Design a protein around this ligand. Structure first.
Ligand SMILES: Cc1cc2nc3c(=O)[nH]c(=O)nc-3n(C[C@H](O)[C@H](O)[C@H](O)COP(=O)(O)O)c2cc1C
Ligand SMILES: Cc1cc2nc3c(=O)[nH]c(=O)nc-3n(C[C@H](O)[C@H](O)[C@H](O)COP(=O)(O)O)c2cc1C
Ligand SMILES: Cc1cc2nc3c(=O)[nH]c(=O)nc-3n(C[C@H](O)[C@H](O)[C@H](O)COP(=O)(O)O)c2cc1C
Ligand SMILES: Cc1cc2nc3c(=O)[nH]c(=O)nc-3n(C[C@H](O)[C@H](O)[C@H](O)COP(=O)(O)O)c2cc1C
Ligand SMILES: c1ccc2[nH]ccc2c1
Ligand SMILES: c1ccc2[nH]ccc2c1
Lengths: 400, 400, 394, 401
């Protein structure tokens, strides 16, 4: 059954037509987000009984990469939707799934999030203060709120305060984006990933109801520290990022090759008759396509392990740690590959590819160079080294 | 996992003695006999013919496992399966019905006499002269005859000469290594792969009987030029090499880390208290370990595709060509990785890992540096680039 | 050291405004006039003819300093000296006695209309003038140019078609149309669009040598073939200058804006071991590349002053220049992209930081001619003792 | 004239003829050390008065690189002689120089050293200097990595004071005869590469060191380095010696590969190549590496000239010394990466028979480079350059920075 991927391929073909002009303007890709809504693919992981497509993580990852190859901002928004959905699905009650998932199919929910902040260090000042009847009031500003614009629901994270049952506990809630007191600020103006709407969101006395809470306050800390099933969220999400990088890489390589076939001039001073026969043009394409073939094959194999563990009732700390090691290794390789490829392929195309800004090939490097900084690859490398040398699995967190 | 556990236990024994054995060079007779007794030489022979009925994924994992311990034994074992692949793809069912039970019962370890030391690799001078009964007489000298010592049979290639039906056609045969006129010269003295017995073999009036011939004269050339199933021999064999390189990489990385945990000193000049906590030491293991995880995951996917096509009655040129591209890609990546890693890991261990020659860690680089030159990775890179850029599959041959 | 101080002060003023100017593209007229007022366009004109009587080492260092502040102004400045070098190597002493004092008095900033089977023809007229027709591409510095160095191929010529002629002409000569069609990834203010020649008359006292003389000089490896190594080392210094500017600009950001990765236990970004390793690797390569380029620049000056140059001397210089360009190309391309990893996501999240200018400028200009063939040329020399075949690119 | 460099070039020619067979055996290259003695080059930095050659550091560095290109062990022994000489010259008294330097010319001294130890880390020194009467010291303990300790006319030796009323833990250095009673050169050097540098252990049992053999007072070196006084030049001088070893090895390896490619490599006729020397990828490998080598070598010449300029100054500021160390460290980083990559990757330009035939011996270049580049970790040289560039902090002077 290749139907969902055919749908994703068609969406990607449509986005390529206009990505050049859209990403320059920046702002919100409303018409494209609506196309994704009409496609149904946002419901890939909702069971058919709940109205969804009942598909699997390997299908999701393939779709992410295909869309990302055409438009990295739409690939990112799509992918982050599934990170948000993964978190919801790992913590939602049976009651929450029974009503939210049919509603997500019917209202075509495209999820956004508000998690990170811009404080002195990456570790939170957005507060959740208890109310009567079990409610909480959210106050503060979040940064890098990907897909916060035109989101139907926001996955929001806060830390308890003035809480008789414990301060500093992490609350997560799934709330309407138009809930009173929620202000999406629209201040995203980035080198690349220009249509991800990853600006700031301000919360002024925003009410969260108990039926919107994803677990009890602090449950995510307990689930991660114990390697409970929700600790799969991080390898899942980091593998989503990996697939954005491989998709950008593939898109840049294909776009460059089409330029070389149709536009490059041979370096006829050295007796080359066509650029596509030049030994150094061929070596550049061979070196990068070969690394891409291995990385994609490896990413498929890790995607299948995500699915296998996703279906288990219990995942051991060793199973989760090994997956996280495999995922981090994939992200490392994909980061280096995409950053190098999107810059060096100009050398296979020639000066005219840069002399006309409107050709727009630099979008691939700008998108990859922006996103690959999401968290430092130097510390993903350290985690894999600490694992290999010292037999220490990474400590489960939002980042590892 | 039975077969793989046997391979692991063999490797563990080989590790104890490889340092002393490979200095001397020469034939690792005791270790070859232990491989004979293991049964693993029969991995791909069907259970009906007395073999293990196993698959290429298992063979590839066993090759890498043995090579991680002793690269020469891994090579001999791996090349045995390249020789077996050729016999299987070209021999008649009647031949295999006789040979394969005999190979089980007599514990056959196959060697080959194929390449030559002439002006270029596309220039064979070992000749097959047709005799009236359908026999041939082989004359000339072969080079790089891996596993030619202590071999139960040699896979021999020659070109027809004095042939009224056409000179220059390639014939292949499977013959006893002690047949009259066969002289294994024992002149292998190399930088690495020191116990592969890849010396020269001289044929003086060597008779080949019709029931020892593999196909008809020039049939292998016809199969290559057609991209038909017997041309799978090359991607199969090139993926064997790939697994040697991944196995050496993994062995070198594990041996380095044992030294780093046990013997490396902290660089207290800079405030480090434990070498295993040094950030640059950790970054070296992390970078190489990550690349190895991705390469090993991708290699497993290509190994499954080898098994799929291996089981088909007919293979198209597009199936074979796509597989060869995937193999070539894995070989490029594995080559770069093992060459870099076996040299750079010294930087994670310190000067005394090199100042004490008897630690012997340079064996990994010597073995990898020798074997990776088998055929030029620059032209594997070209082949992948010519495919990606120009949609041309590699021209099938003994190398591509 | 005065010339270099003047260049340093020019560069300081250029850094204030480059971020806003380069976005707009077009012609940096005010900055070109500041260069005119500095006197530095006359660095290589002898004091006898009213210039500064300075050396190629000073010129190269000045180019790299200006480039580190504004790569387009560094390129325009550098190319001026490529154009000047061509004039000096092919002009008659009588031509120089007129042109160079005029260049000083009128503060000439030279431009180029050479690159484009040449579509720009020179048809001989009976007096020895030539009529030029066609459109040139990549005419760097073609706007606001006091003179253009122009190349064309003879056509309808009893004395031989396909011979290269070169001339130095006014940019407002009748029939010259500078098109302003330059909208590029980087080098955005170099005015490297096209120039259209419609029946443009070039007079005999404007011609540089005789038709085909530049080809014969290349084939001879004689002194005028120095033009290529000279110009390729100009490019090298553009790349070194961009490298240095990017590194210093990144470091400023790291000191002022980078957050530490507290989840690793890091207290300060400037103490992060991996941040420090990025700056160390790139700063170390940059030091060596800069030191090596100073030595090649001294050799340019040595041969520049000779009456005669052998093909061996020229070929050895070209190999040294090619080597420096190769190292400088790899360095600037890798550095301008990887330094983001030392600064953090917010350096890319805020487009207005504008750090991507360094990569865009370097990524654009390094494509001028393919570094893969500079590598082949050095390898063919080392392995086969064959010098590069002289051309406009080697 | 180029007389001294001509002498070095002729020495290196002769060493090349026999290095392949000599380094296999390891042990002491006595005959070659004697040829260096007869050459007079060990006196390069002794004034023409005192009988030396009155030459400069740039000449020294060029000779080191030239000899190293032919025989890395002899290049190392030669370069380390000048590191030892530099330390002596920076700390010796005027009467010590008046006696030692003519004696070094007369007796053709080839210096070695016994400095490092094999304890828990490189700061953990346990070879002790215990006071004797009349200002002498007794040395006890074992040193490791004692380069040139065999066949040495004098050993430069380092110890830490113990049971010393004038203060314990102070570093003393002395220049002593290698056959003084109680010095035992152990002959246990058996290395991957640098196999003829005699960098094994030396054991000191009751060895007497006299006051006129002490190089400054105990602890003077700590003050001179910490303060950036003139002796703090010893480290950039010596690290630049290491840099020229790597560039010498790189050049010798590149030239040996090119000889093999021209005469033994086969064309990959499968792809239509008729001559390996016209193969586009063979040419790219030689071009990449020759290009980086030219730039590294040109750069090294500039830094060598700066060494000479500061060597001649009466006082060097911390900023001048720190700039020099950063330039030296930069040169060493680039040269380290270059030699390690080149000596491995050039096999790809040569072909499989270059590895298949052990006796070709090309792996010597990698073995020598891979061994010596580990002397001190390049990762911390990189960190030191980065700390300077980002934080404007010069390296803290030490025996390594
Ligand atoms: C080939 C070689 C020669 C050396 N020669 C000396 C020497 O002459 N004097 C000295 O103090 N250290 C010498 N060293 C050692 C370094 O100063 C340092 O002690 C050593 O490289 C650190 O070892 P480790 O990284 O295993 O901990 C030498 C090291 C090598 C590899
Ligand atoms: C920024 C830039 C400036 C250039 N300036 C000049 C110039 O002033 N004069 C000239 O003859 N060529 C100039 N070129 C010409 C390059 O040689 C040419 O664009 C390149 O070789 C074409 O590569 P392609 O045909 O594969 O696209 C310039 C190129 C670039 C990228
Ligand atoms: C393109 C982009 C999208 C991001 N999206 C999210 C997001 O959806 N949710 C989130 O919590 N953080 C998001 N982040 C934040 C990063 O995880 C992290 O906060 C940031 O890289 C820190 O910046 P620094 O390295 O300068 O300190 C995003 C970052 C980037 C660059
Ligand atoms: C360690 C090693 C083992 C080899 N074993 C075989 C072999 O068993 N059969 C064969 O036909 N060629 C073998 N080869 C040789 C390659 O097929 C090929 O002939 C090689 O490229 C030598 O050529 P070169 O020196 O020109 O690069 C081997 C090569 C090496 C380095
Ligand atoms: C190259 C050519 C022919 C061969 N037969 C077995 C191996 C092998 C390698
Ligand atoms: C550390 C201490 C003293 C030394 N003398 C020569 C090298 C060296 C290293």
């Amino acid at each position: 059954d290749h139907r969902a991927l055919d749908v994703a391929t068609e969406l990607a073909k449509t986005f390529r037509v206009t990505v050049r002009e859209r990403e320059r303007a920046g702002g919100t890709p409303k018409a494209e987000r609506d196309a994704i809504r009409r496609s149904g693919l946002l419901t890939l992981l909702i069971s058919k009984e709940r109205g969804g497509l009942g598909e699997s993580w390997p299908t999701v990852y393939e779709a992410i990469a295909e869309i990302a190859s055409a438009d990295a901002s739409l690939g990112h928004l799509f992918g982050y939707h599934f990170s948000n959905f993964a978190y919801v699905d790992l913590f939602a009650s049976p009651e929450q799934k029974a009503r939210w998932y049919p509603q997500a199919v019917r209202e075509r929910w495209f999820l956004g999030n508000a998690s990170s902040e811009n404080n002195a260090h990456v570790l939170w000042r957005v507060t959740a203060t208890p109310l009567p009847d079990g409610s909480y009031e959210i106050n503060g500003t979040k940064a890098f709120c990907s897909g916060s614009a035109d989101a139907d629901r926001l996955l929001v994270f806060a830390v308890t305060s003035r809480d008789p049952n414990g301060d500093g506990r992490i609350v997560a809630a799934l709330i309407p984006s138009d809930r009173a007191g929620v202000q999406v600020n629209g201040d995203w103006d980035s080198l690349g990933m220009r249509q991800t709407d990853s600006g700031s969101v301000t919360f002024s006395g925003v009410v969260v109801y108990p039926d919107e809470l994803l677990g009890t306050p602090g449950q995510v800390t307990d689930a991660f520290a114990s390697g409970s099933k929700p600790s799969l969220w991080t390898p899942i999400t980091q593998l989503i990022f990996t697939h954005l990088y491989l998709g950008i890489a593939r898109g840049a390589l294909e776009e460059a090759a089409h330029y070389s076939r149709s536009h490059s001039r041979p370096f006829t001073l050295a007796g080359v008759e066509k650029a596509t026969e030049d030994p150094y043009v061929l070596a550049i394409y061979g070196e990068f396509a070969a690394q891409l073939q291995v990385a994609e094959a490896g990413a498929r194999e890790v995607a299948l392990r995500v699915q296998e563990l996703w279906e288990r009732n219990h995942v051991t700390p060793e199973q989760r740690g090994q997956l996280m090691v495999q995922v981090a290794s994939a992200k490392i390789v994909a980061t280096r590959l995409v950053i190098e490829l999107t810059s060096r392929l100009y050398e296979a195309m020639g000066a005219r590819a840069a002399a006309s800004r409107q050709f727009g090939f630099d979008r691939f490097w700008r998108d990859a160079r922006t996103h690959t900084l999401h968290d430092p690859v130097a510390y993903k490398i350290r985690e894999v080294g600490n694992w290999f040398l010292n037999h220490r699995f990474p400590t489960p967190s939002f980042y590892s």
